[PDB]
Design a binder for this molecule. Structure first.
Ligand SMILES: Nc1ncnc2c1nc(N)n2[C@@H]1O[C@H](CO)[C@@H](O)[C@H]1O
Length: 382
């Protein structure tokens, strides 16, 4: 008895959980009313373990003991050059333990603890499991968990292990671009089709070329940029306003960490608003040295601030087409994945690259992967 199997998108920055109930996929909101949960864990000085929104919305006061991006370390050895590069940019301690990059944190009152990346991901998975259990009114024991198509054997096993620690029997490990394609019903098509999945997440950019033949998916080629995502677009806007504030007031905002967090929160909200509105206003009370911040951002300035980054997304799309021996016209379906794909310039750039071809539409791009996982979870629940 597998019970109600859950579909989990375990993302670098955000995670999503869905179930198949009363003939359809249900994406489940967490205890904070959010349909996506940050892949964050924080250990407060009192010793409280925070997971998700509570962990992320506290990150500024606790940078050493706030764990995130464990997905960059999962199933990798300590000496992996990717690990050695990534830990340079992580604020929490990472130590070699049992050949692996273990995360070291103060769990409260100076007591130090080490966690394998799969133990951190198990805490995120536990939060997803609780979110689904609150929704279903019953215990969840089985799951379908997605991973990037480039994940190797050790990375897929470590994701299954994270599940085991969380009390989830991960029945199927499925590729994130395949789950997105299933979400759009591209599996029940007929004949041979080439699917381009363009996945621009919060911190990663993944491009996958998939082939669908008689309902069977094959990942032909993968590319992207491991350090390009929505957060980089935020950072460009942060830089623009920190520069502007120094020009206007002569003050250096970054001297106050509390002032940068506040600007980060408002910049992110402004960015999201600019996907639908042509201008957003950032207002922050007692911003720096009791003085208030009031500035506006147009979609045009935002696009100009991020143009090189937006344009850089087209290079891995060209590399996957070459590595698949395909041309632009051979792409039958374009799947956009990640909240960042809601950016109008990103949607124009993809459409124009594929000479006017419209991408698949209807499912929230930030939920498409968990949606696909839930579709598969639905079949397995029977
Ligand atoms: N409507 C939107 N417009 C622009 N960016 C959006 C967005 N929605 C999300 N989630 N995002 C970004 O997706 C990433 C992961 O959640 C983050 O960088 C979000 O800001």
């Amino acid at each position: 008895d597998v019970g109600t199997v859950v579909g989990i998108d375990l993302g670098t920055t955000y995670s999503c959980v869905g179930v198949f109930k009363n003939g359809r996929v249900e994406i489940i909101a967490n205890d904070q009313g959010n349909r996506i949960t940050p892949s964050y864990v924080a250990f407060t000085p009192e010793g409280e373990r925070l997971i998700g929104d509570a962990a992320k919305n506290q990150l500024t006061s606790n940078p050493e003991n706030t764990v995130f991006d464990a997905k960059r370390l999962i199933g990798r050895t300590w000496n992996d050059p990717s690990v050695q590069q990534d830990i340079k940019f992580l604020p929490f301690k990472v130590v070699e333990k049992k050949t692996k990059p273990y995360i070291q944190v103060d769990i409260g009152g100076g007591q130090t603890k080490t966690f394998a990346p799969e133990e951190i991901s198990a805490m995120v998975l536990t939060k997803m499991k609780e979110t689904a259990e609150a929704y279903l009114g019953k215990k969840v024991t089985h799951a379908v968990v997605t991973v990037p198509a480039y994940f190797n054997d050790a990375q897929r096993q470590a994701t299954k292990d994270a599940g085991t620690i969380a009390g989830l029997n991960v029945m199927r490990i499925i590729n994130e671009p395949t789950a997105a394609a299933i979400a759009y019903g591209l599996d029940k098509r007929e004949g041979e089709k080439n699917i381009l999945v363009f996945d621009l997440g919060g911190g990663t950019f993944d491009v996958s070329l998939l082939t669908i033949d008689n309902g069977v998916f094959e990942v032909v080629a993968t590319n992207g940029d491991t350090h390009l995502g929505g957060e980089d677009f935020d950072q460009r806007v942060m830089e623009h306003f920190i520069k502007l504030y120094k020009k206007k007031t002569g003050k250096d905002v970054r001297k106050d960490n509390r002032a940068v967090q506040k600007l980060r929160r408002e910049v992110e909200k402004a960015k999201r608003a600019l996907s639908s509105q042509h201008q957003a206003r950032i207002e922050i009370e007692s911003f720096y040295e009791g003085e208030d911040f009031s500035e506006t951002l147009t979609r045009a300035k935002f696009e100009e601030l991020n143009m090189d980054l937006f344009r850089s997304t087209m290079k891995p799309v060209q590399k996957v087409l070459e590595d698949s021996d395909l041309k632009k016209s051979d792409i039958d379906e374009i799947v956009l994945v990640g909240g960042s794909t809601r950016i109008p310039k990103i949607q124009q750039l993809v459409k124009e690259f594929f000479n006017g071809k419209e991408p698949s539409r209807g499912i929230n791009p930030d939920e498409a992967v968990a949606y696909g996982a839930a579709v598969q979870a639905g079949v397995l629940s029977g």
